[PDB]
Design a protein around this ligand. Sequence first.
Ligand SMILES: Cc1cc2nc3c(=O)[nH]c(=O)nc-3n(C[C@H](O)[C@H](O)[C@H](O)COP(=O)(O)OP(=O)(O)OC[C@H]3O[C@@H](n4cnc5c(N)ncnc54)[C@H](O)[C@@H]3O)c2cc1C
Length: 391
Amino acid sequence: MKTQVAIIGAGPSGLLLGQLLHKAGIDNVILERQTPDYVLGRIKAGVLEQGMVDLLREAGVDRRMARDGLVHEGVEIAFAGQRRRIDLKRLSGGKTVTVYGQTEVTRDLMEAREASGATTVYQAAEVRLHDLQGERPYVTFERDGERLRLDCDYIAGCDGFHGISRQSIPAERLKVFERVYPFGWLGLLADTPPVSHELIYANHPRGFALCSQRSATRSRYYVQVPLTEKVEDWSDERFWTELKARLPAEVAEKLVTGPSLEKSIAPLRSFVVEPMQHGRLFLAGDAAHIVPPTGAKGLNLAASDVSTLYRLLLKAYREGRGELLERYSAICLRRIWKAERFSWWMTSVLHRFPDTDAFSQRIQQTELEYYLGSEAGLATIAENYVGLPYE
Ligand SMILES: Cc1cc2nc3c(=O)[nH]c(=O)nc-3n(C[C@H](O)[C@H](O)[C@H](O)COP(=O)(O)OP(=O)(O)OC[C@H]3O[C@@H](n4cnc5c(N)ncnc54)[C@H](O)[C@@H]3O)c2cc1C
C-alpha cells in the first residue's frame, strides 16, 4: 500500500495528528501494535492546557469535551500546615486548564477517525522503518503472518517511550538527557465524588499526595511511593489510610472513599532527545521526551509537537515548502525544555527525597513559602501551569 504520511502509534499524539492531517486533505495511515480496547484501558492524563483544548476544537473533536470537561481557574498546594490557592486565571492573565481524561480524548479521536474512513491498522506487529534518508521511505509490518509494505513520503513516530521510532535513528545521531527519580506515583481511580472542586497537591513529611478528578462522581488520587513497591501490596484500605495521613485534617475528613476501578504505579522520569527527527522521520510526544507527571505537561507537550508538525507538513504539501520541515526540532525543543524545567521544579518542591540533609529540607520549604507568598512568584507558577504560548 501507499500513503502520504505514515503514523506509528494510535495514542493521542498519532490520532490527533492523523485527524488534523485528514481534515487538511493529507492522507495518512496509522499503525498500532495493540488493540483499540488496550489503548482505551490506559488511565493517564487528566489535565489539558488551553492550547490543547483549541487544537481539539480545530481537529473538530470537541463536542463531548466541551460538554463534559471541567474548566478550572485555580489549583491548591498544601504544605506544612497551610493550603494555598493559586488563582491561575488572574495570575496568568485570564487562562485556565481543563480537566478531561486522556481515555476520553482518545475515545473521541478514535470515533472521529472511524467515521472519517481514514486508515488505521491495529495489531500491526513487528513494525520496522526503512530508508529514512531516501526520497521514498517505507514501513514494513505483519498483519496475521503476512508482511505488508507501506510506502510513504514521511513518517511520524508517535509510538511513545518504548516505540520503535526512536530506536530506528542511528544512536550516534542522538543526544539523550535523562533523570530518573527515586520514586513513583501510585494512582487510584474511584467512582466517588472528588474531595475538592480544584486539585490539591500536597507536600507532606510522609511523601507527596495529589487529589484530582475526572468528573463530579469520579476521582483520581496519587501518593508518592518508593520504586520498590508492588501494587499488589497496596489494598484499597491501605491506600485510603495512607492518603488521609498525608492530607490536611479538614480535607481528609471530607473524603468519600471507595473501591478502586484502577490502581497502578508510574515511575517518575525526565527524558529529552536531541534532535527530534532524522531524514523523513519526525518524533512526537512520548517518543521524543518524558516529563514527570507533577506539572501535567506530557500530553500537552505532545499536543504542541503535533501542532507544529501538522503545520510544517501543510506548508510542505500545499505550499510545496518542504524545506521548513528542517526546523521542526528547533521549534519544538524551545517549548520542551521550558516545560521540562517547570516539571522538574514542581517535582523537586513537592516530593520527599531520600537522603536529604537539613539544609536542603529547609530550602525546599522556603521555596514553597516564597513562591506561594510572592505575587511575582505565584505568577511564574501560574503562567507555566496554564501553559506557555505555542511558537
Ligand atoms: C500517571 C500519569 C499522569 C499523567 N498526567 C498527565 C496530565 O494530567 N496532563 C498531561 O499533559 N500529561 C500527563 N501525563 C502524560 C501523558 O499521559 C503522555 O504524555 C501521553 O500519553 C503521550 O501520548 P503519546 O501518544 O505520545 O504516547 P502514548 O500514550 O504512549 O501512545 C503511543 C502509542 O504507540 C503505540 N506503540 C508503541 N510501540 C509501538 C510500535 N512499535 N508499533 C506500533 N505501535 C506502537 C503504543 O501502543 C501506544 O498506543 C501523565 C502520565 C502519567 C503516566
